[PDB]
Amino acid sequence: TNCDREPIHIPGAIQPHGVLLVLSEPGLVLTHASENAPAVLGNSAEQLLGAPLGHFIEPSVREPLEADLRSARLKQLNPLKVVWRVDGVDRFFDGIAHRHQGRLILELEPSSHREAVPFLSFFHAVRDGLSRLRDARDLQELCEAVVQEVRGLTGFDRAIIYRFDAEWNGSVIAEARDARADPYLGLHFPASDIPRQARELYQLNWLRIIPTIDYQPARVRALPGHGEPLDLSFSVLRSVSPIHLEYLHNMGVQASMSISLMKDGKLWGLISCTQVSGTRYVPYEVRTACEFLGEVMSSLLAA
Amino acid sequence: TNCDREPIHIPGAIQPHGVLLVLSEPGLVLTHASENAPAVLGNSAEQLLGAPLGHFIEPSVREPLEADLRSARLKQLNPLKVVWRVDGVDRFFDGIAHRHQGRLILELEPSSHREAVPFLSFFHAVRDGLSRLRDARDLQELCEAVVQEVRGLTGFDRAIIYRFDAEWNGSVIAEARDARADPYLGLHFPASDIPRQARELYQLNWLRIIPTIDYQPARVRALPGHGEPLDLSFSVLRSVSPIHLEYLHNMGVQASMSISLMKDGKLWGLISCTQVSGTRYVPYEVRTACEFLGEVMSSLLAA
Ligand SMILES: */C=C\C1=C(C)C(=O)N/C1=C\c1[nH]c(Cc2[nH]c(/C=C3\NC(=O)C(C=C)=C3C)c(C)c2CCC(=O)O)c(CCC(=O)O)c1C
Ligand SMILES: */C=C\C1=C(C)C(=O)N/C1=C\c1[nH]c(Cc2[nH]c(/C=C3\NC(=O)C(C=C)=C3C)c(C)c2CCC(=O)O)c(CCC(=O)O)c1C
């Protein structure tokens, strides 16, 4: 059987800090809703399933949101501004929507604290980060620049560059760390620690975040006739493989984030961040800044 | 005498769509002010020279603005939010401040129309642009991607990649254009069209914009004992060489913007945009998005 066979893209559940909805097209009827929607949204699955999205959206946000969800050209439009009028009292969310395997999936994460101008942090993060990455004169300086930059933006206890060999064993070739985190720099690990179906998924979906490894997976409920396993390959809230969560627990890690490094269309390595402390709910603008720096580093893996 | 000798970094004047101030440190006393300040700011040079900056700033913006100007770490903090309370009635500006040759220069450009969330356009421009640049498989596709991207963001009639040879002659190696603009693709030009002191300045200051070639230069006035030619090398409002403005007039160009392409610390080429139509007051977020794409392209000039 071994490591490579557990699926991972169809867990049937999400990480409960956000809500996952599936929307029909073109009508935007909710055909799936994750069952943590009462805690996060103020509505039940029963109120949600089969209702049109617009019924729950503050009316002045509604028309542009529906226009974006139908756009196809959908991020490029992410993040979507979603304002949920429940009882009502608005709740504010960043929507990340995508199409995959014929379904339109909308993920909702509570909008960040502040007031502190939208997208200003991303502007500074990628400008300052790009010039630090360009200062690097070789691969090893590039790696150290990225890991210092990502740890600064996220606050993670540890950030490494994890590089794959021929073979798919990995090596910790650069590390930035708080002093509370043991040093993994220089360690090599077998290929099965990131098994083959994970590596294949990470060639397509370049960012994953587990802000706490202790969560109760929120099942995705569906209208009768619907689900059938939801392919969650491109969903940021996808519940991750339980055996990886026990790897993290045994390693003493409470939260994780990694970013794929690509070279010639093939997975080259990861930027891997870990928290030994407590949780790490990285905000949207920070995650996206980090993933953007991973793309820059990936494009600089040349000569 | 010839082309290489006219200075260009000390014209004594600026392009009048913004205001240039020089500030003492640490006290932020205005020692220089451009003479278009009545039109743009609502104050005269006489009211400005020798007054502390804070006297003109809306009080809730004032402390953070002064903190930034003293920071050193100054962009990284650009753009500064500057709210000018004159009579009073607030006016809103993006401040771009820099230190050079011992002076602290603050340039003020009216804040953009809207309402349309700050920095959202930059977020989308650099994300969408980076992935189009990464799609390029060789230098020629890179060049065509950049020129299509920059023309899309700015609306310029023409955008070219202008590459320097051994020698500093130039070649138009890629072009995107409205059909109203004659094609320069494939043309070669002598080194003197971008003379040596311009090329040296452009190795240090990677962006220049002339939103209309028909402007009355606004003299920079100074307190007695002060100016002495203000070195405007890193100032975005620097009035450009009059002979270049007549080159543009004869070429039939009403507005221009170029971005330096760097390779191994040496000027490699320019992204050059021209308007045959009318003016081109490119907004701050667009200019910065374009310059960021120029840095990415510069970093990809490798192998
Ligand atoms: C055969 C089953 C598995 C064994 C044994 C094992 O050790 N992992 C197994 C399955 C598995 N791993 C992952 C994802 C994963 N694994 C890592 C490994 C590391 N994290 C570190 O900090 C270090 C060394 C310092 C290593 C090595 C990483 C980075 C990841 C990516 C996720 C993350 O960033 O935390 C999966 C997929 C989990 C999922 O995507 O659902 C599986 C099934
Ligand atoms: C000896 C004096 C000069 C002669 C003769 C001439 O032709 N230019 C001279 C001086 C000069 N040029 C510049 C800056 C400059 N020149 C160009 C040239 C081109 N623009 C085009 O569209 C093309 C071809 C399609 C060419 C060739 C460019 C792009 C620039 C940069 C400024 C801009 O983007 O418009 C200067 C410096 C002007 C300044 O920075 O003050 C000078 C003195």
TrEMBL record, chains A, B:
Residue span, Phytochrome chromophore attachment site domain: 138-295
Membership in a protein family: In the N-terminal section; belongs to the phytochrome family.
Protein name, per record: histidine kinase
Lineage: Bacteria, Pseudomonadati, Myxococcota, Myxococcia, Myxococcales
Residues of the full protein shown: 16 to 318 of 760
